[PDB]
Amino acid sequence: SALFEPYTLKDVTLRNRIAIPPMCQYMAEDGLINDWHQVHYASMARGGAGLLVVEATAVAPEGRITPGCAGIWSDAHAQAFVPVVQAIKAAGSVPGIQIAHAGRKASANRPWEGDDHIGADDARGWETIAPSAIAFGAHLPNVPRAMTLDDIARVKQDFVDAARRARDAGFEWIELHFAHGYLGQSFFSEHSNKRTDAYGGSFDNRSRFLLETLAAVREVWPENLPLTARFGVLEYDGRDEQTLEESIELARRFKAGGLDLLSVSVGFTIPETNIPWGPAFMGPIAERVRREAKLPVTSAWGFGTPQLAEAALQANQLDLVSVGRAHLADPHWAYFAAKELGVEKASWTLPAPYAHWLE
Amino acid sequence: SALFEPYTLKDVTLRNRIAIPPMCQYMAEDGLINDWHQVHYASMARGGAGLLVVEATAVAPEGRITPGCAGIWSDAHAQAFVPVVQAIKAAGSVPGIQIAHAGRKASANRPWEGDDHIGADDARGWETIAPSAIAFGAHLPNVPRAMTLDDIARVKQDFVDAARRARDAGFEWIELHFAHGYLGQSFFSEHSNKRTDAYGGSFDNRSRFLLETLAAVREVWPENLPLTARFGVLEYDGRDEQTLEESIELARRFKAGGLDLLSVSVGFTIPETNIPWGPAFMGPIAERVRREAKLPVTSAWGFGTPQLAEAALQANQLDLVSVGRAHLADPHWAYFAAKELGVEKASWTLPAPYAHWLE
Numbered sequence: 001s002a003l004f005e006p007y008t009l010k011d012v013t014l015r016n017r018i019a020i021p022p023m024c025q026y027m028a029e030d031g032l033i034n035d036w037h038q039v040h041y042a043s044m045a046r047g048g049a050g051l052l053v054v055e056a057t058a059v060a061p062e063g064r065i066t067p068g069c070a071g072i073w074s075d076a077h078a079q080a081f082v083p084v085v086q087a088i089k090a091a092g093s094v095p096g097i098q099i100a101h102a103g104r105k106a107s108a109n110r111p112w113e114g115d116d117h118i119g120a121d122d123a124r125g126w127e128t129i130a131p132s133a134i135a136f137g138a139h140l141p142n143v144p145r146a147m148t149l150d151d152i153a154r155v156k157q158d159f160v161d162a163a164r165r166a167r168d169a170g171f172e173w174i175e176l177h178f179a180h181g182y183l184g185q186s187f188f189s190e191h192s193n194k195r196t197d198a199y200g201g202s203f204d205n206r207s208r209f210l211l212e213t214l215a216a217v218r219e220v221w222p223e224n225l226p227l228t229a230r231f232g233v234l235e236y237d238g239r240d241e242q243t244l245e246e247s248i249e250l251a252r253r254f255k256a257g258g259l260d261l262l263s264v265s266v267g268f269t270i271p272e273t274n275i276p277w278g279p280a281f282m283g284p285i286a287e288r289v290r291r292e293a294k295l296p297v298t299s300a301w302g303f304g305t306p307q308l309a310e311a312a313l314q315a316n317q318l319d320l321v322s323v324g325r326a327h328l329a330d331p332h333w334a335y336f337a338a339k340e341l342g343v344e345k346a347s348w349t350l351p352a353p354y355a356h357w358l359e
Numbered sequence: 360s361a362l363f364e365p366y367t368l369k370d371v372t373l374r375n376r377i378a379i380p381p382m383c384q385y386m387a388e389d390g391l392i393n394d395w396h397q398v399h400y401a402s403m404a405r406g407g408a409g410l411l412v413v414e415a416t417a418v419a420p421e422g423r424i425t426p427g428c429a430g431i432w433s434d435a436h437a438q439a440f441v442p443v444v445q446a447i448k449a450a451g452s453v454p455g456i457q458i459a460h461a462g463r464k465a466s467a468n469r470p471w472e473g474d475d476h477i478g479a480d481d482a483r484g485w486e487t488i489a490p491s492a493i494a495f496g497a498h499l500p501n502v503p504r505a506m507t508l509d510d511i512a513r514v515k516q517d518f519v520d521a522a523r524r525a526r527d528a529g530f531e532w533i534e535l536h537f538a539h540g541y542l543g544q545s546f547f548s549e550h551s552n553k554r555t556d557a558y559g560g561s562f563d564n565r566s567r568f569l570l571e572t573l574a575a576v577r578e579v580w581p582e583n584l585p586l587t588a589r590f591g592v593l594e595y596d597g598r599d600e601q602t603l604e605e606s607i608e609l610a611r612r613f614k615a616g617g618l619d620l621l622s623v624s625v626g627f628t629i630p631e632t633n634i635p636w637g638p639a640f641m642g643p644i645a646e647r648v649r650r651e652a653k654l655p656v657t658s659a660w661g662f663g664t665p666q667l668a669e670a671a672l673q674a675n676q677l678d679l680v681s682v683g684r685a686h687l688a689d690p691h692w693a694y695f696a697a698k699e700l701g702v703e704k705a706s707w708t709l710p711a712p713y714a715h716w717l718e
């Protein structure tokens with residue numbers, strides 16, 4: 001089974017090709033994770049996945065999506081992650097973390113509490129920042145404040161500080177969240193970046209925030225640990241051909257800037273899109289990025305069955321398969337995939353107190 | 360769905376009829392549970408089961424099965440369970456514990472480390488006790504020491520002390536382990552009880568240790584919390600008709616002694632048996648116990664498919680369906696059952712951070 005071949009990137013070895021992608025839990029308070037996350041991540045790591053990327057973790061308070069999002073903007077926040085890192089490691093999985101800034105999509109309600117921007121009368125909300133003072137729209141109508149040059153310098157430092165905190169907490173894998181219409185993605189997209197200074201206008205200027213943030217993180221992130229990013233390479237906004245070509249060129253510059261692997265996703269920068277949802281629909285897009293940027297990739301959004309995950313590898317589209325919702329439904333999904341794929345001693349994807357009885 | 364009707368017993372209400380039966384994890388050290396159990400139990404409780412009965416927990420060190428078994432023979436041991444109790448309650452499940460004494464099956468290796476008796480001279484092994492100085496045989500050759508009347512008094516008091524500690528840790532449900540060939544079961548079975556004093560020989564005498572332990576525990580266990588027991592009602596030794604009839608009579612005396620529910624199982628007292636290798640063979644047996652002893656019952660051994668569990672409840676065979684190994688494979692099995700049975704808002708069998716996305 002290709003899905004259960006180990007994978008080595010820099011000096012880190014994943015025991016299989018199953019990655020749990022970042023998945024916000026909305027259960028933190030003031031950015032501080034707690035027993036919800038401890039059990040959530042430990043249980044999934046024991047389920048057998050080779051890599052567990054902890055949810056989008058805010059580099060700054062206003063970079064949270066919701067009042068329930070995790071943060072790593074202080075050392076106490078980072079210390080809260082230590083037992084999570086150690087629990088993922090004890091299960092034999094590799095602990096990773098996605099550090100993020102929600103940009104204009106910040107200051108929103110939890111998904112089951114409206115999923116929409118928090119109103120100005122609500123005391124829980126806050127002012128959002130973004131490259132330009134233009135709203136996402138739809139259920140996220142709050143217009144963000146346009147960032148100053150000092151904002152840009154401060155946020156980049158927040159990414160540096162968060163990467164250093166993630167490193168010191170013991171994460172062996174970091175993912176910069178440059179996707180899904182949050183801050184980084186919105187600097188790259190002309191839909192949301194209306195700037196005329198050095199951070200908007202041209203391709204170089206729109207790339208500048210992401211390339212500089214990557215460069216600043218690379219200076220503090222160890223060379224022997226994978227430095228990755230999630231990036232939306234197309235929007236399904238009717239401009240996919242040119243957007244994908246620009247996104248792949250940026251991925252080439254990420255590679256030259258020391259990025260080890262690209263988590264290929266959709267931009268979600270604006271609501272006015274037509275995303276063709278279907279099983280493994282990102283397959284050919286991830287493969288094109290993989291081949292044209294010559295960079296290892298993972299992807300998500302419909303690979304969450306054993307056969308689809310395996311086929312994505314057999315087809316040389318992905319190096320790692322990210323399986324998200326299936327792991328919320330079944331924290332031991334990796335074990336389920338091992339069985340479904342007829343892996344030898346499949347039950348031993350799990351720790352002995354389970355494996356012995358399921359063989 | 361009958362499986363997702365709530366169930367009320369004394370002052371406890373289970374949100375559904377799915378019980379997680381006790382399942383030894385063999386991960387404790389000197390009886391002390393740890394982060395293995397914390398995540399294991401909290402994750403399963405979040406999976407949606409209405410009742411989680413924590414594994415066989417030894418009332419005394421020599422009553423462990425293995426060096427990895429949990430114990431509750433001191434207040435420090437009981438304190439270790441408090442976070443487990445509270446995590447199970449926080450997920451909306453009801454915390455239970457099975458208190459146990461392995462009898463002549465004690466001092467054995469973990470199942471995946473040989474599963475056989477450890478010699479008492481071995482630093483990890485110890486001397487076993489039983490109603491009669493007769494070995495189980497096969498891979499459990501250690502001959503136990505026949506218990507004196509003072510031994511009987513000591514062990515019953517250990518059950519009492521353990522029930523008090525379980526109450527103080529916050530357990531809302533207790534199960535006496537009188538099954539599976541351990542101490543209590545072996546007092547009841549003529550195969551293992553060769554005593555001629557007041558605790559062997561007749562039906563009354565063989566029943567005495569179990570009835571006296573129940574009575575002693577009944578004194579300290581709160582009237583408003585279910586007092587339950589697990590008992591092997593037949594052995595598949597060719598004496599099943601006479602054995603089951605005596606077992607149903609003991610269930611009647613259990614009820615008269617204040618037992619609230621009986622977990623019906625197999626004896627496993629000796630190895631020379633022909634136990635059915637198949638699912639749900641206990642259904643009609645448990646139904647007979649339920650109807651002839653007029654006592655609520657649960658059972659296990661192969662009910663871990665949603666349709667089988669639903670069928671056992673529709674047939675009035677069980678009041679609760681115990682689903683064990685399926686929860687080792689999938690801690691969210693209760694959610695999987697909700698889906699398969701077409702329960703409305705099935706995803707909300709799970710907490711919101713999962714439920715919202717699985718709709």
Ligand SMILES: Cc1cc2nc3c(=O)[nH]c(=O)nc-3n(C[C@H](O)[C@H](O)[C@H](O)COP(=O)(O)O)c2cc1C
Nearest residue numbers: 021022023024055056300301302304323324325716
């Ligand atoms: C509850 C939930 C939270 C998510 N949070 C994040 C996140 O914090 N960062 C991110 O990059 N993607 C996030 N995603 C997107 C997932 O990482 C993944 O791409 C998505 O679930 C699709 O993959 P799947 O079909 O296997 O579920 C989230 C998805 C879900 C369902």
Ligand SMILES: Cc1cc2nc3c(=O)[nH]c(=O)nc-3n(C[C@H](O)[C@H](O)[C@H](O)COP(=O)(O)O)c2cc1C
Nearest residue numbers: 357380381382383414415659660661663682683684
């Ligand atoms: C790993 C494991 C540990 C078990 N430990 C106990 C136990 O401690 N006490 C008990 O009464 N039964 C124990 N059993 C028996 C189970 O509680 C249950 O009766 C058995 O798994 C049959 O149910 P199932 O078919 O749903 O798995 C254990 C079973 C397993 C698989």
Ligand SMILES: CCOC(=O)/C(=N\O)C(C)=O
Nearest residue numbers: 024056065177179180268
């Ligand atoms: C619309 C896609 O955005 C995401 O997946 C996300 N984070 O990146 C969430 C849901 O928190």
Ligand SMILES: CCOC(=O)/C(=N\O)C(C)=O
Nearest residue numbers: 382383415424538539627
């Ligand atoms: C074979 C029947 O015995 C059991 O089920 C058991 N405990 O009761 C264990 C720890 O396996």
Ligand SMILES: [Cl-]
Nearest residue numbers: 388389390420
């Ligand atoms: Cl000890």
